[PDB]
């Protein structure tokens, strides 16, 4: 507050995008029930991906 | 909290400028009183004399052009630093597990209400998961039922 | 950061606009003060006198006509210099993996 | 449930909703289980 008849009310735009990547960012990974799923390439190592 | 204040003084603004606008002071010069017939107020009968101009209303202030541009400002602000809205469609636990729900037209993708889910989504994997583990726990070490 | 800070300077440019003109000082002569009747604020008694002309609004500066240009410029800027949005549809992991 | 066009998603809506859902926890439910409790302990009917 540079002066007090200056009244400065501050303009919070930082928290707002922050926010708004946020939501879209646990709405993409912590979305689902799990997390990860592991996937293989053949059947001779599926028994461990699960 | 400074949206609320910040709202008030504009709003006391507004207020004190009609709470003296309704007054209708009247200026007037000296030699056109006429108390008996000024004092009375019945539609007519009235003596605006002394050259006829010599009464008018009194030049109050005009409002600020700019107030609304701020409400407007304000308004939206509120509406998209959180998760309310005027008309906006309320949020349920089947769109909360997927927001393609109702991908046919209830897309959801509005900022408020992603906002608002982001929220939800915290309390729940903070609060009321924490709390059913912390019971079955418990359960789970104490009693025979 | 600077985005906020312009926004802020604009913003306060703006709100002390507002925080004087409603203070609504009158401007007013010598003759016509009759303190009596001026500080009386009813609706009905004032005293305009000498010459009707002796008393008017205080002439406050006029808003700055290019500033709304200015506040929707750091707006869009904001909209699209990022992946924020006032009502845009929030992504979904599909999506993610196809946008299609 | 009537997803269809009554999306119901308005301010006003909810904000009554919520009051309602309040009255029936708060409410309706205990008065049931009060009088549940109390048909259970007394008389033979």
């Given at each position: 507050?540079?002066?007090?008849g ?20 646990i ?24 | ?82 998760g309310v ?19 046919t ?12 889910r ?28």
């Open positions: 507050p540079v002066t007090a200056s009244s400065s009310w501050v303009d919070r735009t930082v928290w707002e995008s922050v926010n708004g990547t946020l939501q879209d960012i709405n993409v990974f912590c979305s689902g029930d799990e997390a990860v799923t592991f996937v293989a390439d053949n059947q001779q190592d599926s028994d461990a991906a699960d | 909290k400074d949206i609320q204040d910040l709202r008030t003084a504009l709003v006391r603004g507004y207020i004190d400028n009609v709470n003296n606008a309704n007054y209708g002071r009247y200026k007037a010069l000296v030699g056109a009183y006429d108390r008996r017939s000024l004092l009375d107020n019945r539609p007519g009968g009235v003596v605006e004399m002394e050259r006829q101009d010599a009464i008018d209303l009194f030049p109050y202030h005009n409002l600020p052009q700019g107030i609304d541009g701020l409400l407007g400002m304000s308004e939206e602000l509120k509406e998209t630093r959180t809205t005027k008309l906006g469609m309320g949020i349920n636990p089947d769109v909360f597990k997927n927001d393609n729900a109702y991908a037209v209830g897309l959801m993708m509005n900022a408020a209400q992603n906002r608002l982001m929220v939800c989504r915290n309390i729940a994997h903070n609060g009321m998961v924490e709390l059913m583990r912390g019971i079955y726990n418990l359960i789970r070490e104490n009693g025979e039922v």
